Design a protein around this ligand. Structure first.
Ligand code: CLA
Ligand code: CLA
Ligand code: CLA
Ligand code: CLA
Ligand code: CLA
Ligand code: CLA
Ligand code: CLA
Ligand code: SQD
Ligand code: PTY
Ligand code: LHG
Ligand code: SF4
Lengths: 209, 230, 41, 740, 83
C-alpha cells in the first residue's frame, strides 16, 4: 500500500507507515522498542535538520566564493576564520556547548515527558515550548507555519524528512569528493557540467586505483 | 533421440518431458526434489533456481557470443571501421589484454553506469523471483504494467518482454522453449571456446576459425598447445 | 532490537564495556599526561 | 547412491537463544543457582553429545563449528598479512635479509613501550618477529606492500564468506545425516579435490610466479625493477630468458618429453647457497608430484559409478587368524562416532605436525630461513608443541568415544574387542618397557653425574670414557649421504645437510652444517623414547580402562569426566580417563620440553654459528659432546650458560621477554594451588567469606561455590602448561634474539 | 606425440589394449565389480549404443588408466634408454 525502499519487499512490523518518510527500510531491526523508536525519530529529525543547515551554509559560502566574494572553502573554513574572529577558540566552543546543552536537555526532558516544559518553569510560558508531536515542538517554533492544518503539516513533515535524508547524502558526498578532489563542491559541480563525459568520480586518480 | 551419453539412472525418474530442456543428461544429479527439502527458501540447489540460472546463463551466453564475434567479420569486411574492430578481450574488459582508448567515457565510468543499470535490473529480477508479480504493484515511472510476469519467474512475458507475443499455442511455445534452451546450450560451449581460444592463441575466435580452415593439421589443438602463449 | 539487546545486557558484554571504558580511560590519562609519582597538584 | 541431502531452514535466525545463555543443556536451562553453573556453561558449551542424542544435529553443529574456526583462522591470517603490509620492514628486508632483522609488530608509545621498538635495521623500529612470515613472503614471490594489502583484504573477504557459509549451512540449509555419512565421497573429494587441487595450484603458482621472482632475487637484482608476476604469466618472452624450457610452451608436457623441463623442475639435493633454503624448482616438481599422487589416490573409493573401492569391504576382507574377526565393524564405528574420527584425525595431525617441525629443522624450505635461527627455532618448537597437543587431544577424544559411543553389540571378536580383552597384557608390557627405558636412560644420566662428582670421568658414559655409539643412526646418516651415489643416481647431492660433508653459509653465518651423533645424542634420544613410551602408556591406559576396570567395573555408567568414585577401595581419585589425559598433558610437557632443549642445545653447539676463514665457530663452544651426558652439565651449560641475556634484557629491546619469563614463572607456580589442594578446604574458606559478605548484606543471589575437582584439575593443568610454555618461549626467543 | 613416434605407438597400443581389456569382461569396469579375481557381472546406468557396459565413466576411467600406464612405460623406457 506504500512505496517501499525495495519493490516487493516485506515491510517491518514496527514500521506501519505512520511516521514521516516511512519507506520501511530497516534491516538491522533498530527502533523496534517504542521508546527507542521515539529516540530514533528524534535523532533522525535533529541530524536531518543539522545536515540541511550545514549543507545550505556550505553551498551559500561556496557560491559566494565562486562569484568573486572573499569566502573560504567548506573545509578549513574555521581554521582561517579563527585568526580573524574576535572570539578565540576555547571560549567559543565552550559557550556554544553550554547554550546547546541548555537547549538540548530542555528538549531531552521534553522528549522524556511530553509537555514537561510547558508548565511555565522557563520564564512563564505555557503554550510555547511544549512538544506537539514526537520530534516536533510548538509555540515558539511555529511562528507563521501551517502546522495547524493536518494535511499540510503531514506534507511538510514528509518534505522535511526527505530533504533531510537528501542533505545527509549531500554531506557525505561533500566530504567524499572533497577528499577526492580537494576543491569546493560548486567547483566539482561546474567541472561535472563542463566535461561530463570525462570528469567524474573515476578519473580523479584517488578512489579508483 | 532421447537421453544422453552420461544419463545416470535414478535421475530420469524425476524428469520426463516437463522442463524446456529435460534431455536426460544429469550424471551427477542436482534436480532431485529430495535435495533441499523442508521449508522456506533454503538453498540454490533446487530445480526451480537451477532452471532459472540455466536460462539466465544461456541468454547471457547468447548475448556474449553475439557480441564477441560480431565486430570481427564486420571488421574483416567494410561494415564497421577496423579502428573500432578489435578482439573482444581487448575492448577494456581485460586491461592487461588491452583497452579501447577512443571511447566516449572512461571504462570505469561505463562500469559505474552498467553497475547502476544492471543493479536495478537484477535486483528487480530477484525481488520478482522472491515475490512473483510484485514489481507491478510498486510505482516505477509509470511502466508497472509490463512487469507483471508469469507463473514462471524465468519466463515473465508481458507487453514488453514478449511484445511480439507469438507462440500462444502450447506446442509452438514448447518448440520455442526447446530452441531457446538448445541455442543457449550451444552458446555455453561458444563462450567456453571463445575464452579457451583467447587464452591459447591471443587472437580472436574467427581468426582461429580461419587458421583451422586454411590448415587443419597445422592449426589445431596439438600445434597450438605446443606454441607460444599456451 | 529487544531480543538482541537482552543478549547485549549479559555479563560477557558487561565484561567488555567496563573493561573497554576503564582501560581506555587509563590509556588517555597516561597518554595526554606524562608518568607522575606525586599528587602535588 | 551418493547425493546431497539438505534440510532447508531447521533453525530460525534470531537472538532468542542468545538472550538465555543456558540453552544447550537442560540441566543448565533452569538457572544459575550456584557459581558452578557458569563453569558448566562454558564447559558444556561445545559438548554436543549431551545437548541432543540426534547425530544429524551434532553433525550440523560440528560442520558450522569447523566453518567458524576456518573463518577465525582466515581472519587471523588476513590480520598477519595486513600487519606485514602496514607495520613492517618487508621492503627493507627484501633488499637486505642477512643484516636486517624481521619486524612486523609495532607497539604504541603509551607507557614506556618505546623501548620494545627495537632497532631491527632498515630505518624501522618494532617488535622483532619470529614466525618467519618474511621468509614465506620471499618464497611465494611478493615484492611490495600493495600485494600484502590485497592478500589481507582477500583473506578478510574469504573469512566473511566462511562465516556466512557456516550460518547458511546450519541455519538456512543444513545437510542431513546421510550427507555426512558419505565417507567415500568425502575421502575422494578431500584427496583429489582439496589436497590434490591445492598442490597443483601451488605448483602452478611456484612455476609461473615464484620461480622467476626467486631467480631474479638471488642474482642481485633489486626487487624494485623486478617484473611483476603477471608479466611472467602473460608474456612467454620474459619467462623464456630465465627458463629456456618455456620457449617450447607446453609442448613437452603433452608430447611426453618431460626431460626438457629439467631447468625449473629440477631434482637437486641440498640448499641454495645464495639464500640457504631449498631450490624453488625442486619444490615445484615436489608439489607437482604430490598433486599427481593425490589426484591418482583421490579416485580409489566407490561413490556413485560402480567402479572404486568400498571401505566396508576392504575392512571386512582383511582378516588374519591371530586377530579373529579382522576389522569387521570399524566402518560402522567410524561412520557413526564423531569422537573416534576426531581421535584418528587429531593423532595423525599431531604426528604430522611433529614431522613438519623435524623436516623444517632438517631441510629449510624458505630463503634466508636457515640463517635466521630465531625463525627456525620458533617454528620447530611451536609445531612440536602443537603436534603434542593434538596427540594428547586424540587420546582424550578416543577415551570419550570409549565412554560414550562404544557399544558391545556390533563388536564381538574384532580388533577393538580383542584390544579390550588383552589390555592388561599391553599395559604390563608397556610398564616393563617403561621401567627398562627409564632405568637405562636416566640411571645412565645419574651414573654419569655421580662419576663426574666422584672425580672419575673415565668411568662415565661419554666419548672419552666408555661410550654408547649410536651405530644405527650414524649408518643411516652414511647411507643417506651415499644415497645419491648409488640408490638415487639422479640426485645432485644429499637430500639434507644433516649427513652431508659440506657447510653452507649465507651472510657469514652458518646456514646448515653436518651433524655428528655421539654418546650424548644416544642418551637424549633414548630419554625421549622413554618419555614418549610413558606418555603413550598413560593415554592408552586411560583409553582402555575408561569403560571398565578391575577396580571400578561400572566406570562406563559414571561418564567420561567424573572426579572420583569416592574414597572406597582405598580411594579411587583421578580414576577417570579425563584425569589420565590430565596427567598425560604434564608428561607431554616434560617430553616436548626436553626435546626442544635438546634441539636448541644441539643446534647451537653443533650447527648454528658464524663461519670464519679459520674454520667454523659455533654459537657455543661445542660443549654438547662433553656436557650433555650429565644432569649438572645439562643444567649449567644450557639453562645457566644461556638465559644470561634474559636476565640482562631489561632496558633493551627484549625486556618484554624477561617480563614474560617472570609472568610465566608466576603462572606456572600459581597452578600448584589447583594441583596439590582439594575442594573441601576451599569450600570452607568460601563459606567463611560468604559469612563475611552476609554480615553487612552484600550476599550475592548466586551462591559462591568452590571449583569442582575436575574443574580444579583443569585449571591447574591449564595454568601449569601455559606457564611452562611461556617460560620456554621467552627463554628461547630472548636467547636466540640477543645472540643469533 | 608426433604421428609415427614410438611414444605415440606405445600410447595408442596401451589405449587399445585397455579398451579391449574392458570390452569383454577381463577388467574391473562399471559392469564388472572386482573381487580378488573380479567376478559377478553387475549392471547399472546404460551403455548408450554399443553393447556390454561402455558407459560415460567406463571409457573415462579406462582412458585414464591407459594414459597413466603409458607414462610409466614411456618414461621407464626413456630412463633405461629405449625408444
Ligand atoms: C549542552 C550540551 C549538549 C548536551 C547536553 C547534548 C545532549 C544530547 N544531544 Mg547534542 N549536541 C551538542 C551539545 C549537547 N548535546 C552540540 C554542541 C551539537 C552540535 C550542533 C550537538 C549535536 C547533536 C546531534 C546531531 C544529536 C545530538 C543528540 C543528543 C543526545 C544524545 C546524547 C548521547 O548519547 O551522548 C543528548 C540529548 C542526538 C539526539 O538528540 O538524539 C535523540 C543527535 O542526534 N546532539
Ligand atoms: C525546507 C525544509 C523544511 C521543511 C519542509 C520543514 C517542515 C516543518 N518543520 Mg522544520 N526545520 C527545518 C527545515 C524544514 N522544516 C530546519 C532546517 C530547521 C532547523 C532550524 C527546522 C526546525 C523546526 C522546528 C524547531 C520546528 C519545525 C516545524 C516544522 C513544521 C512546520 C510547518 C511549516 O511551517 O513549514 C515549514 C516550511 C519551510 C521550512 C519552507 C521554507 C524553506 C525556505 C524558503 C528555504 C530558504 C531559506 C534558506 C535558509 C536559504 C537557503 C539558501 C541556499 C540556496 C544557499 C513542518 C513539518 C515545527 C513543527 O513540526 O511543529 C509542529 C517545529 O516545532 N521545524
Ligand atoms: C573437492 C571438493 C571439496 C573440497 C575442496 C573440500 C574442502 C574442505 N572440506 Mg569438505 N566435503 C566435500 C568436498 C570438498 N571439501 C564433500 C563432497 C563432502 C561431503 C561428503 C564434504 C564434507 C566435509 C565436512 C563434513 C567437513 C569438510 C571440511 C572441509 C574443509 C577442511 C578444512 C581444511 O583442511 O583446511 C583447508 C581450508 C581451506 C582450503 C580454506 C578455504 C575454504 C574454501 C572457501 C572452501 C572452498 C571449497 C569448496 C568445496 C568450494 C565449493 C563450495 C561452494 C558452495 C562455495 C576444507 C575447506 C570441514 C569443514 O567444515 O570446513 C568447511 C568439515 O568438517 N568437508
Ligand atoms: C595449476 C596451475 C596452473 C595454471 C593456472 C597455469 C596456467 C597457465 N600456464 Mg602453466 N603450468 C603449470 C600449472 C599451471 N599453469 C604446471 C604445473 C606446468 C608444468 C611445469 C606448467 C607449464 C607451463 C608452460 C610450459 C607454459 C604454461 C603456460 C600457461 C598459460 C596457458 C594456459 C593454457 O594453455 O590454457 C589455455 C587457456 C584456457 C583453456 C582458458 C580456460 C577457459 C576459460 C577460462 C573459459 C572462460 C570463458 C568464459 C565463459 C568467459 C570469460 C568471462 C568474460 C565474460 C569476461 C596459462 C597462463 C604457457 C604460457 O606461458 O602461456 C601464456 C607456457 O608456455 N605453463
Ligand atoms: C622428574 C620428576 C619425576 C620422576 C623422576 C618420577 C618418577 C616416576 N614416575 Mg612420575 N610423574 C611426575 C614426576 C616424576 N615422576 C609428576 C609431577 C607427575 C604428574 C603428572 C607424574 C606422573 C606419572 C605417571 C602418570 C606415571 C609416572 C611414573 C613414574 C615412574 C617412571 C619410572 C621409570 O620408568 O623411570 C625409571 C626410574 C626412575 C627415573 C626413578 C629414579 C631412578 C634413579 C636413577 C635411581 C636408580 C636406582 C638407585 C641406585 C636405587 C637406589 C637404592 C637405594 C634405595 C639404596 C617413576 C616411579 C609411571 C609409572 O608408574 O611407571 C610406569 C606412570 O605411569 N609418573
Ligand atoms: C571393441 C569394440 C567396441 C568399442 C570400443 C565400442 C565403444 C563404443 N561404441 Mg560400439 N559397437 C561395437 C563394439 C565396440 N563399441 C559392436 C561390435 C557393435 C555392433 C556392430 C557396436 C555398435 C555401436 C553403435 C550402433 C553405437 C556404438 C557406440 C559406442 C560408444 C558408446 C558410448 C557413447 O558414445 O555414448 C562407445 C565409444 C554409440 C556411439 O558412439 O554413440 C554415437 C553408437 O551409436 N557402437
Ligand atoms: C616397460 C616397463 C617399465 C619399465 C622398464 C620401468 C622402469 C622404471 N620406472 Mg616405471 N612404471 C611402469 C613401467 C615401467 N617402468 C608402469 C606401467 C607404471 C605405472 C604404474 C610405472 C610407474 C612408475 C613411477 C611412478 C615411477 C617409475 C620409475 C621407474 C624407474 C624405477 C627403476 C629404477 O630407477 O631403479 C629402481 C629404483 C628403486 C627405488 C628400487 C625400488 C626399491 C623399493 C622402493 C624397495 C625405472 C626407470 C620411478 C622413477 O622415476 O625412477 C627414475 C618412479 O618414480 N615408474
Ligand atoms: C546474503 C543474504 C542472503 C543469504 C541467503 C541466500 C539464500 C536464500 O535464502 O535464498 C536464495 C535467494 C532466493 O531464494 C529462493 O527462494 C525459493 C522460494 S523461498 O523463498 O525459499 O520460499 C526457493 O525455492 C529457492 O531454492 C531459493 O533459492 O536467491 C538469491 O539470489 C538471493 C540471495 C542473494 C545473495
Ligand atoms: C592510483 C590509481 C589506481 C590505478 C593505478 C594504475 O593503473 O597503475 C598501474 C600499475 O599500478 C597498479 O596496478 C597499482 C594498483 C594499486 C594502486 C599502471 O597502469 P598503466 O598506466 O600501465 O595502465 C595501462 C594498462 N592497461
Ligand atoms: C612390540 C609389540 C609386539 C606385539 C606383538 C603382537 C601384535 C598383535 C598380533 O598378534 O597381531 C597378529 C598379526 C597377524 O594376525 P592376522 O594376520 O590374523 O591379522 C591381520 C588382520 O588384522 C588384518 O601378526 C602380526 O601383526 C605380526 C607382527 C607382530 C609385531
Ligand atoms: S580426595 Fe577427592 S578425588 Fe580423591 S576419593 Fe576423595 S573426593 Fe574423590
Amino acid at each position: 500500500d506504500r512505496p517501499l525502499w525495495s519493490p516487493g519487499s516485506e515491510p517491518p512490523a514496527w514500521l506501519d507507515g505512520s511516521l514521516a518518510g516511512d519507506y520501511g527500510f530497516d534491516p538491522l531491526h533498530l527502533s523496534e522498542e517504542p521508546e527507542m523508536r521515539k529516540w530514533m525519530v528524534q535523532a533522525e529529525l535533529v541530524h536531518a535538520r543539522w545536515a540541511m543547515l550545514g549543507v545550505a551554509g556550505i553551498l551559500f559560502t561556496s557560491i559566494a566564493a565562486k562569484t568573486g566574494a572573499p569566502f573560504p572553502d567548506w573545509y578549513d573554513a574555521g581554521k582561517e576564520a579563527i585568526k580573524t574572529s574576535p572570539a578565540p577558540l576555547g571560549s567559543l566552543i565552550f559557550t556554544e556547548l553550554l547554550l546547546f546543552g541548555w537547549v538540548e536537555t530542555k528538549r531531552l526532558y521534553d522528549l522524556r515527558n511530553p509537555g514537561s516544559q510547558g508548565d511555565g518553569s522557563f520564564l512563564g510560558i505555557t503554550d510555547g515550548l511544549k512538544g506537539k508531536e514526537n520530534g516536533y515542538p510548538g509555540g515558539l517554533f511555529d511562528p507563521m507555519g501551517m502546522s495547524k492544518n493536518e494535511a499540510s503539516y503531514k506534507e511538510a513533515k514528509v518534505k522535511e524528512i526527505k530533504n533531510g535524508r537528501l542533505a545527509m547524502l549531500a554531506f557525505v558526498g561533500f566530504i567524499a569528493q572533497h577528499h577526492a578532489t580537494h576543491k569546493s563542491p560548486i567547483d566539482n559541480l561546474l567541472d561535472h557540467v563542463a566535461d561530463p563525459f570525462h570528469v567524474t568520480f573515476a578519473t580523479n586518480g584517488v578512489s579508483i586505483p | 533421440d532421447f537421453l544422453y551419453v552420461g544419463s545416470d539412472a535414478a535421475a530420469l525418474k524425476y524428469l520426463d518431458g516437463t522442463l524446456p530442456g529435460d534431455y536426460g543428461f544429469d550424471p551427477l544429479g542436482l534436480l532431485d526434489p529430495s535435495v533441499s527439502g523442508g521449508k522456506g527458501e533454503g538453498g540454490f540447489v533446487n530445480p526451480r533456481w537451477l532452471q532459472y540460472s540455466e536460462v539466465i546463463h544461456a541468454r547471457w551466453a547468447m548475448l556474449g557470443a553475439a557480441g564477441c564475434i560480431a565486430p570481427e567479420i564486420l571488421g574483416k569486411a567494410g561494415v564497421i571501421p577496423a579502428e573500432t574492430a578489435v578482439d573482444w578481450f581487448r575492448t577494456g574488459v581485460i586491461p592487461p589484454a588491452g583497452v579501447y582508448k577512443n571511447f566516449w567515457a572512461d571504462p570505469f565510468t561505463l562500469f559505474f553506469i552498467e553497475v547502476v543499470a544492471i543493479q536495478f535490473a537484477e535486483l528487480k529480477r530477484l525481488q520478482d523471483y522472491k515475490n512473483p508479480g510484485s514489481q507491478s504493484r510498486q510505482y516505477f515511472l509509470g511502466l508497472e504494467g509490463l512487469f507483471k510476469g508469469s507463473d514462471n519467474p524465468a519466463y515473465p512475458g508481458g507487453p514488453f518482454f514478449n511484445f511480439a507475443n507469438f507462440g500462444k499455442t502450447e506446442e509452438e511455445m514448447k518448440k520455442l522453449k526447446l530452441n531457446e534452451i538448445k541455442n543457449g546450450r550451444l552458446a555455453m560451449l561458444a563462450m567456453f571456446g571463445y575464452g579457451a581460444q583467447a587464452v591459447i592463441t591471443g587472437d580472436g575466435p574467427f581468426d582461429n576459425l580461419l587458421a583451422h580452415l586454411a590448415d587443419p593439421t597445422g592449426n589445431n589443438l596439438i600445434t597450438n598447445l605446443g606454441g607460444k602463449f599456451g | 532490537m529487544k531480543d538482541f539487546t537482552t543478549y547485549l545486557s549479559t555479563a560477557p558484554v558487561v565484561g567488555l564495556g567496563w573493561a573497554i571504558f576503564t582501560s581506555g580511560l587509563l590509556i588517555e590519562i597516561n597518554r595526554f599526561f606524562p608518568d607522575p609519582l606525586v599528587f602535588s597538584f | 547412491k551418493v547425493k546431497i541431502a539438505v534440510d532447508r531452514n531447521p533453525v530460525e535466525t534470531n537472538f532468542e537463544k542468545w538472550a538465555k545463555p543456558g540453552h544447550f543443556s537442560r540441566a543448565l536451562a533452569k538457572g544459575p543457582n550456584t557459581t558452578t553453573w557458569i563453569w558448566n556453561l562454558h564447559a558444556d558449551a561445545h559438548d554436543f553429545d549431551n545437548h541432543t542424542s540426534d547425530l544429524e544435529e551434532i553433525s550440523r553443529k560440528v560442520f558450522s563449528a569447523h566453518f567458524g574456526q576456518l573463518g577465525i583462522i582466515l581472519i587471523w591470517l588476513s590480520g598477519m598479512y595486513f600487519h606485514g603490509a602496514r607495520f613492517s620492514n618487508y621492503e627493507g628486508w627484501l633488499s637486505d635479509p642477512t643484516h636486517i632483522k624481521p619486524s612486523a609488530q609495532v607497539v604504541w608509545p603509551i607507557v614506556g613501550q618505546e623501548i620494545l621498538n627495537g632497532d631491527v635495521g632498515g630505518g624501522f623500529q618494532g617488535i622483532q618477529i619470529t614466525s618467519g612470515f618474511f621468509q614465506l613472503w620471499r618464497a611465494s614471490g611478493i615484492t611490495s606492500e600493495l600485494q600484502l594489502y590485497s592478500t589481507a583484504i582477500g583473506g578478510l573477504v574469504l573469512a566473511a564468506a566462511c562465516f556466512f557459509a557456516g550460518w547458511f549451512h546450519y541455519h538456512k540449509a543444513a545437510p542431513k545425516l546421510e550427507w555426512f555419512q558419505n565417507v567415500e565421497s568425502m575421502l575422494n573429494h578431500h584427496l583429489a579435490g582439496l589436497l590434490g587441487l591445492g598442490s597443483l595450484a601451488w605448483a602452478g603458482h611456484q612455476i609461473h610466479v615464484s620461480l622467476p621472482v626467486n631467480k631474479l632475487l638471488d642474482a642481485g637484482v633489486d626487487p624494485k625493477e623486478i617484473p611483476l608476476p603477471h608479466e611472467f604469466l602473460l608474456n612467454q618472452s620474459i619467462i623464456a630468458d630465465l627458463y629456456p624450457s618455456f620457449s617450447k610452451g607446453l609442448a613437452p608436457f603433452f608430447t611426453l618429453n618431460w626431460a626438457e623441463y629439467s631447468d625449473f623442475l629440477t631434482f637437486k639435493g641440498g640448499l641454495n647457497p645464495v639464500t640457504g633454503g631449498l631450490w624453488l624448482s625442486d619444490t615445484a616438481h615436489h608439489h607437482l608430484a604430490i598433486a599427481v599422487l593425490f589426484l591418482v589416490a583421490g579416485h580409489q573409493y566407490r561413490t556413485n559409478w560402480g567402479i572404486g573401492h568400498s571401505i566396508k569391504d576392504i575392512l571386512e576382507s582383511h582378516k588374519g587368524p591371530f586377530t579373529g574377526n579382522g576389522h569387521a565393524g570399524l566402518y560402522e564405528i567410524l561412520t557413526t562416532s564423531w569422537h573416534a574420527q576426531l581421535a584418528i584425525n587429531l593423532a595423525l595431525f599431531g604426528s604430522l605436525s611433529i614431522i613438519v617441525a623435524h623436516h623444517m629443522y632438517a631441510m629449510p624450505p624458505y630463503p634466508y630461513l636457515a640463517t635466521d635461527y630465531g625463525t627456525q627455532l620458533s617454528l620447530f618448537t611451536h609445531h612440536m608443541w602443537i603436534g603434542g597437543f593434538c596427540v594428547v587431544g586424540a587420546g582424550a577424544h578416543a577415551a570419550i568415544f570409549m565412554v560414550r559411543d562404544y557399544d558391545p553389540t556390533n563388536n564381538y571378536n574384532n580388533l577393538l574387542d580383542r584390544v579390550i580383552r588383552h589390555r592388561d597384557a599391553i599395559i604390563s608390557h608397556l610398564n616393563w618397557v617403561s621401567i627398562f627405558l627409564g632405568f637405562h636412560s636416566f640411571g645412565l644420566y645419574i651414573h654419569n653425574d655421580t662419576m663426574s662428582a666422584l672425580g672419575r670421568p673415565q668411568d662415565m658414559f661419554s666419548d672419552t670414557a666408555i661410550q654408547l655409539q649410536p651405530v644405527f643412526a650414524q649408518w643411516i646418516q652414511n647411507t643417506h649421504f651415499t644415497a645419491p651415489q648409488l640408490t638415487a643416481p639422479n640426485a645432485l647431492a644429499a637430500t639434507s645437510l644433516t649427513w652431508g660433508g659440506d657447510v653452507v653459509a649465507v651472510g657469514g653465518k652458518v646456514a646448515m652444517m653436518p651433524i655428528a651423533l655421539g654418546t650424548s645424542d644416544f642418551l637424549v634420544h633414548h630419554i625421549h623414547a622413554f618419555t614418549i613410551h610413558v606418555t603413550v602408556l598413560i593415554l592408552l591406559k586411560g583409553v582402555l580402562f575408561a569403560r571398565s576396570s578391575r577396580l571400578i567395573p561400572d566406570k562406563a555408567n559414571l561418564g567420561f569426566r567424573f572426579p572420583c568414585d569416592g574414597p572406597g577401595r582405598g580411594g579411587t581419585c583421578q580414576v577417570s580417563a579425563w584425569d589420565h589425559v590430565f596427567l598425560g598433558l604434564f608428561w607431554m610437557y616434560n617430553s616436548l620440553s626436553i626435546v626442544i632443549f635438546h634441539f636448541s642445545w644441539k643446534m647451537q653447539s653443533d650447527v648454528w654459528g658464524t663461519v670464519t676463514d679459520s674454520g667454523v665457530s659455533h654459537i657455543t663452544g661445542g660443549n654438547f659432546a662433553q656436557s650433555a651426558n650429565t644432569i649438572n652439565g645439562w643444567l649449567r651449560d644450557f639453562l645457566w650458560a644461556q638465559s644470561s641475556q634474559v636476565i640482562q634484557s631489561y632496558g633493551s629491546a627484549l625486556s618484554a621477554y624477561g617480563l614474560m619469563f617472570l609472568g610465566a614463572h608466576f603462572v606456572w607456580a600459581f597452578s600448584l594451588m589447583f594441583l596439590f589442594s582439594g575442594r573441601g578446604y576451599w569450600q570452607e574458606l568460601i563459606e567463611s567469606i560468604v559469612w563475611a559478605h552476609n554480615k553487612l548484606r552484600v550476599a550475592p543471589s548466586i551462591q559462591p561455590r568452590a571449583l569442582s575437582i575436575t574443574q580444579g584439575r583443569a585449571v591447574g593443568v591449564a595454568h601449569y602448561l601455559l606457564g611452562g610454555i611461556a617460560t620456554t618461549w621467552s627463554f628461547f626467543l630472548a636467547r636466540i634474539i640477543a645472540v643469533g | 606425440s608426433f604421428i609415427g613416434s614410438p611414444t605415440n605407438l606405445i600410447m595408442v597400443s596401451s589405449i587399445g589394449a585397455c579398451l579391449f581389456a574392458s570390452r569383454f569382461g577381463l577388467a574391473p569396469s562399471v559392469r564388472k565389480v572386482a573381487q580378488p579375481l573380479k567376478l559377478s557381472d553387475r549392471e547399472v546406468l546404460q551403455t548408450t549404443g554399443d553393447p556390454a557396459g561402455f558407459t560415460a565413466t567406463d571409457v573415462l576411467a579406462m582412458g585414464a588408466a591407459g594414459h597413466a600406464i603409458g607414462v610409466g612405460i614411456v618414461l621407464g623406457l626413456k630412463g633405461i634408454g629405449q625408444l
